[PDB]
Amino acid sequence: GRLAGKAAIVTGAAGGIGRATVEAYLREGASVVAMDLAPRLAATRYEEPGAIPIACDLRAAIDAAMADAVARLGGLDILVAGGALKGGTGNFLDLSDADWDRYVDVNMTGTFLTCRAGARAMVAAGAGGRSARIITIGSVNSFMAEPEAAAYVAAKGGVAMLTRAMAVDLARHGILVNMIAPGPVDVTGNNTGYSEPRLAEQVLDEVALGRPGLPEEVATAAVFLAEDGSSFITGSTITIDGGLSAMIFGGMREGRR
Amino acid sequence: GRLAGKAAIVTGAAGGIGRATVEAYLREGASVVAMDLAPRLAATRYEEPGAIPIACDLDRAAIDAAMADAVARLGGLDILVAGGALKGGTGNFLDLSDADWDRYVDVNMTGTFLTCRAGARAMVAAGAGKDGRSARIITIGSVNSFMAEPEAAAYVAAKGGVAMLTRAMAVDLARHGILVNMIAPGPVDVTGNNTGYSEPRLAEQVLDEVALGRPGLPEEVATAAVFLAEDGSSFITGSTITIDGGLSAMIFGGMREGRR
Amino acid sequence: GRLAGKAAIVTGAAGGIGRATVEAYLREGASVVAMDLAPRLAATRYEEPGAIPIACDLDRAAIDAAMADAVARLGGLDILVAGGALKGGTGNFLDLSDADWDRYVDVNMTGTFLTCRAGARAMVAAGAGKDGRSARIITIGSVNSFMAEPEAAAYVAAKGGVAMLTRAMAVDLARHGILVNMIAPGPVDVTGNNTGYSEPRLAEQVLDEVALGRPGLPEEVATAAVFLAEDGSSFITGSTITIDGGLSAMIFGGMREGRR
Amino acid sequence: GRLAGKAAIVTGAAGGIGRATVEAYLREGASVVAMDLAPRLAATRYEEPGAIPIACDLDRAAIDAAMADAVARLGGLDILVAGGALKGGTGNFLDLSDADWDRYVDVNMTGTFLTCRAGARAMVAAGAGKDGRSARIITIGSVNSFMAEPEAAAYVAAKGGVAMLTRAMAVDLARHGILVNMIAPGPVDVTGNNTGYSEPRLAEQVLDEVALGRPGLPEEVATAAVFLAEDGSSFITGSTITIDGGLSAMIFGGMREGRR
Ligand SMILES: CC(=O)N[C@H]1[C@@H](O)[C@H](O)[C@@H](CO)O[C@@H]1O
Ligand SMILES: CC(=O)N[C@H]1[C@@H](O)[C@H](O)[C@@H](CO)O[C@@H]1O
Ligand SMILES: CC(=O)N[C@H]1[C@@H](O)[C@H](O)[C@@H](CO)O[C@@H]1O
Ligand SMILES: CC(=O)N[C@H]1[C@@H](O)[C@H](O)[C@@H](CO)O[C@@H]1O
Ligand SMILES: OC[C@H]1O[C@H](O)[C@@H](O)[C@@H](O)[C@@H]1O
């Protein structure tokens, strides 16, 4: 396997993308801690065996969970920071302090705290001929805004520049740092995530491939960015969006018109 | 003047860029509130007359109070320039403390959010759009909103936050007659002394990395704040004007003829 | 006027954006050559007086001849706006012919290169930088310089070409006192008739994809050509000013309140 | 192997990146045509067996002939890597000749267009999509697709062209079951000798501007060509994978701890 013998922590590991990443990592020979909220971990099953579940709460909690995870793995080669609150709130005019703080604190500051803890553990465990790997999960919303979700969109721009600042500062310490930017991803397991009629029409217009992605289609990039061969890739984004961010006036194309 | 009769609030108005913007706005016929920390306002003079100083503190209670007072004194609000910002690095990301992280995110990202939400609500209350013309929000980000300097992860992250906040604001506020854009400065000498980038290793890297081979002046950034606030810029929203002497356009600038 | 005493060439000067730029430049005190095809110049009127018409054809021989004549009549060159462009799509990439490819690349990419090389040489010959101020090259790209419309691969490719040409020119010409920037318009109605984007499916997609919910006017683009040509923009080079009503800032605009 | 049973054409297959890609593709179970100039193919050896060499001249007649022959021998086409490219600078933009311009645009932009149009038509003819899996076009651009090096305006312009071509292809070919992406390498040492970036001023600027402080190896780029060609990458189209050791992510790298 392409990750044979590597120690990995995946946060948000109960959710769609996090879950698909745990499974792809186990399948490629890694030892994997799956970190998420206690209830969620309780309620999930993985199609691959070997996952070490560890409950956490995306500051004291984060440090405790990360220390425990590194203790059980005997080190740390790979961090996938997949923990994230999703969803919109309404127009920016009515955006409350509580909604702002929740998205910024959970998504931006939570990812910072997790990645600082991970990076320090990687250095302590001797990162660097080969390099440790930090992988953040951002969004096409790290670059272009959806309506009525200013707190989530701002946080994602924060995560994108955090990723680049981390790449720059951690290069000397033998750690490579990159982001994965998914477009729409159906996480229902049911093919019902984007089935609301107006939403399904706009997916057909705005995504070149005309559909949402599956979690497995994102996890594959997390393997690519964790493997030995990706040793000159740092500070970059792998965008996984079926052409969403590449296209304008996609509603006018042949086949849609 | 190009801003004749418009009501403007400029935050960070004691600092270099904020100060140059207050002066350009007064020169172009606007009524201007200059907002900054009380001490700083006390210690500044403007080369143009008419500025209405109002002390503020980018808590949240403070921001609302200062904005309400500002709008009361202006009799409305057409233009907001959110220039308040903590600058500077801390050290390597490995040693970045919770306190430094929180301070940059809370002051630069959340402070800009709180100021812009207050501003936007005041603009709507004052009838933005009603005569066919649009109110204007202008945020000051940085080349660090797109590319990272070393040893400043908290500041760089916050600037990415401000860049996407700006685009989310543009999208949501278009229906309310408000246009929202960012100005992204590269290196800007704010000493008044031409000494801001004079440390020898730094001055060498400015010569290599900036195509024009020098730092900018605050006035060179203020000119874009006038452009983005004027009536003519009525189809410009969700965009960035980058003011960096070619920094973000160039790679291997140390190899160019004249440098090598 | 903001361009008082400056010598400017505007190419594509019969067309919408080029015409609006000639008029804004005359209104701001510049001496202006209007360059375009002979027939088109014959068929156009400007709402401002003073334009020096000069026919051209974006041969290479033609471009040099026209530029030499223009510079002779102006007595120098401070400002070039390279607005000449073939627009329009062809069909799916699978069926894109050699003739359509060559025509879009040759006219839009190479024609902009030839015009800007001639302009830059003339600017240096006329002493660009000598008075501490810089000459200015302004290219007209598109949102298609960064994101692709369907069924227009030749036009889209050429626009990405022009975007990178612009940056390469910024880097190489900084030492010669010339600043180089691009303007990237989104949809612009050039009918004078409010009928450019009136086909019903198209009008629906403009409402969905443009935050301001309409096409721009030529005048809304020209305003940036003045900003980029004036003395105050002296630290701005290698950049893009995007004028698209939020098109490139937004995704899933069809879902927003007021549209769904 | 991850490409087991797939038919691939790799152009520029004698050169560093193209060679490393042919080898990685053979190692992952693909049948591979290696396309390049006749002399170069004659002079190269691959560390893996199975390559089908086919001479070509990125010569429009030549391209079609070589591609028809390649598809005939493979019995179809699942994967195209368009790696053919002229590299190198010329001098300042002011002195850039028509002949250098045309050679870079014609070989790098137009040659990539002709190759990819041929490839895409073959892929459709061979039934791309029928089994629910998609054919794959991979273009080799550069960090110069986005930011300019000095003294290489023709090469840089062409790379911006190839970047936007890639996106226009992604958009138009999605309905035909083909995914299209670019790989953007930073500095890559293609000497086999660790001498590519050894000139002292250059080596110094690589240390300053690349976060990893070195050039890449061809193998470090080829790995992304495998990723983009495999079945798992089925939601990735219109994108860029940048492989540059942090070059495009960083500013003022010369100031970082360990360098200053
Ligand atoms: C606001 C929000 O939570 N957006 C989701 C998803 O709903 C979107 O489809 C996707 C990008 O379109 O971003 C996100 O992953
Ligand atoms: C970290 C920080 O505060 N950066 C400053 C300044 O020091 C830099 O020169 C400039 C970007 O280069 O950004 C900023 O305006
Ligand atoms: C194919 C083409 O020429 N595109 C035009 C115009 O049709 C579009 O509306 C505009 C914005 O997409 O780009 C362009 O200026
Ligand atoms: C001039 C030129 O052809 N640029 C090449 C290469 O020489 C550079 O090292 C690389 C990184 O700048 O870009 C390119 O791939
Ligand atoms: O010229 C300074 C330069 O720093 C880097 O090398 C790159 O990220 C460029 O984009 C930036 O412009």
Torsion of CA D57, D61, D63, D67, to 10 degrees: -140
Ligand 5 centroid from CA D248, angstroms: 6
The residue whose two tokens read 């591979």 is: D32
- Crossing angle of helices C200-209 and A197-206, in 10° steps, is 100
Sheet hosting strand D240-243, strand order edge to edge = D52-55, D31-36, D7-11, D79-82, D135-140, D178-185, D240-243
DSSP at A234: -
End-to-end alpha-carbon separation of chain D, Å? Answer: 45
Compute the residue count for chain C: 260
For residue A184, list chain D residues with Cβ-Cβ distance below 8 A. Answer: none
Please name every residue paired with A79 in a beta bridge, in sequence order, or none if there are none: A9, A134
**For a pocket test of ligand 4, which of D93, D104, D108, D142 has the largest count of ligand atoms closer than 8 A to its C-beta?**
D142
Phi, psi for D40 (deg, rounded to 5): -65, -45
CA distances from residue C71 to B36, B57, C34, C77, D242 in whole angstroms, order as listed: 49, 55, 12, 6, 43
Provide the residue range defining the domain that includes A67.
1-257
Ramachandran sector of residue D132 (left: φ over 0; alpha: ψ -120 to 50; beta: rest): left
Assess contact for D140 and D82: CB atoms under 8 A. Answer: yes
DSSP at A106: I
Three-state SS annotation for chain B: CCCCCCEEEEECCCCHHHHHHHHHHHHCCCEEEEEECHHHHHCCCCCCCCCEEEECCCCHHHHHHHHHHHHHHHCCCCEEEECCCCCCCCCCHHHCCHHHHHHHHHHHHHHHHHHHHHHHHHHHHCCCCCCCCCEEEEEECCHHHCCECCCCHHHHHHHHHHHHHHHHHHHHHHHHCEEEEEEEECCECCCCCCCCCCCHHHHHHHHHHCCCCCCECHHHHHHHHHHHHCHHHCCCCCCEEEECCCHHHECCHHHCCCCC
Residue whose Cα lies nearest atom 10 of ligand 4: it is: D187
Determine, for residues D235 and A246 on separate chains, whether the beta-carbon distance falls below 8 Å. Answer: no
Angle, vertex CA A89, rays to CA A87 and CA A95, nearest 5: 140
Ligand 4 centroid from CA C115, angstroms: 26
In this complex, the residue of C170, C233, C245 whose CB is nearest that of residue B237 is C245
Assess contact for A206 and A250: CB atoms under 8 A. Answer: yes
The half-sphere exposure of D225 on its side-chain side, counting CA atoms within 13 A, is 32
C198-201: long-range contacts, CB 8 A cutoff, minimum separation 24:
C201/A251, C201/A252, C201/A257
| Residue B227 CA, distance from chain mean position | 14
CA distances from residue C260 to A193, A198, B44, B125, C254 in whole angstroms, order as listed: 18, 7, 50, 25, 6
Assess contact for B12 and B36: CB atoms under 8 A. Answer: yes
Collapsing DSSP states into helix, strand and coil, what is residue A78?
strand
Which residues of B touch chain C, with CB atoms under 8 Å apart? 167, 170-172, 174-175, 186, 211-213, 216-217, 219-221, 223-224, 227, 230, 232-246, 248-250, 253, 256-258
The residue whose two tokens read 């429009």 is: D60
Ligand 4, residue D215: give the atom nearest the CA.
9
Report the C-alpha gap between D172 and A71 in whole angstroms: 51
Ligand 1 centroid from CA B86, angstroms: 31
Assess contact for A84 and A12: CB atoms under 8 A. Answer: yes
Residue whose Cα lies nearest atom 14 of ligand 2: it is: B187
For ligand 2, say whether the CB of B15 is within 6 Å of any of its atoms.
Answer: no
Ligand 5 centroid from CA B226, angstroms: 28
Experimental method: X-ray
Q: How far is B137 from chain D (nearest CA, A)?
A: 28
In this complex, the residue of C167, C249, C258 whose CB is nearest that of residue B170 is C249
DSSP string computed for C163-205: HHHHHHHHHHHGGGTEEEEEEEE-SB--SSSS-TT-SHHHHHH
Assess contact for D134 and D177: CB atoms under 8 A. Answer: yes
End-to-end alpha-carbon separation of chain B, Å? Answer: 45
Q: Locate the chain D residue with the closest alpha carbon to B153.
A: D250
Report the C-alpha gap between D134 and D99 in whole angstroms: 39
Assess contact for A213 and A184: CB atoms under 8 A. Answer: yes
The tokens describing A234, both together, are: 């740092």
Determine, for residues C94 and D168 on separate chains, whether the beta-carbon distance falls below 8 Å. Answer: no
Please name every residue paired with C242 in a beta bridge, in sequence order, or none if there are none: C184
The residue whose two tokens read 């969620």 is: A40
Residue C138 CB partners (closer than 8 Å, separation 6+):
C79, C80, C81, C82, C180, C181, C182, C183, C225, C228, C229
Scanning D75-152, the segments in alpha helix (DSSP H) are 98-104, 111-125
Flag whether C156 is marked binding.
no
The tokens describing D170, both together, are: 């992604």
Give the residue from C165, C234, C235 with the most B CB atoms within 10 Å of its CB, the best one to mutate: C235
For residue C156, list chain D residues with Cβ-Cβ distance below 8 A. Answer: 164-165, 167-168
Assess contact for A11 and A18: CB atoms under 8 A. Answer: yes
Q: How far is A98 from chain C (nearest CA, A)?
A: 22
Any idea which ligand is nearest the CA of C149? 3
CB-based burial label for D71 (10 Å; 0-12, 13-18, 19+): buried
Determine, for residues D160 and C158 on separate chains, whether the beta-carbon distance falls below 8 Å. Answer: no
Q: Which residue precedes each gap in chain C (C to N above 2.5 Å)?
A: 58
Any idea which ligand is nearest the CA of B152? 2
Compute the residue count for chain D: 260
Report the C-alpha gap between D130 and B239 in whole angstroms: 42
**Closest CA relative to residue B225, chosen from B71, B35, B30:** B30
For ligand 1, say whether the CB of A152 is within 6 Å of any of its atoms.
Answer: yes
Structurally, chain A folds into a number of domains equal to 1
Q: Assign residue B11 the CATH number of its domain.
A: 3.40.50.720
Kindly tell me the sign of the dihedral angle through the C-alpha atoms of D26, D31, D34, D35.
negative
Please name every residue paired with B184 in a beta bridge, in sequence order, or none if there are none: B242
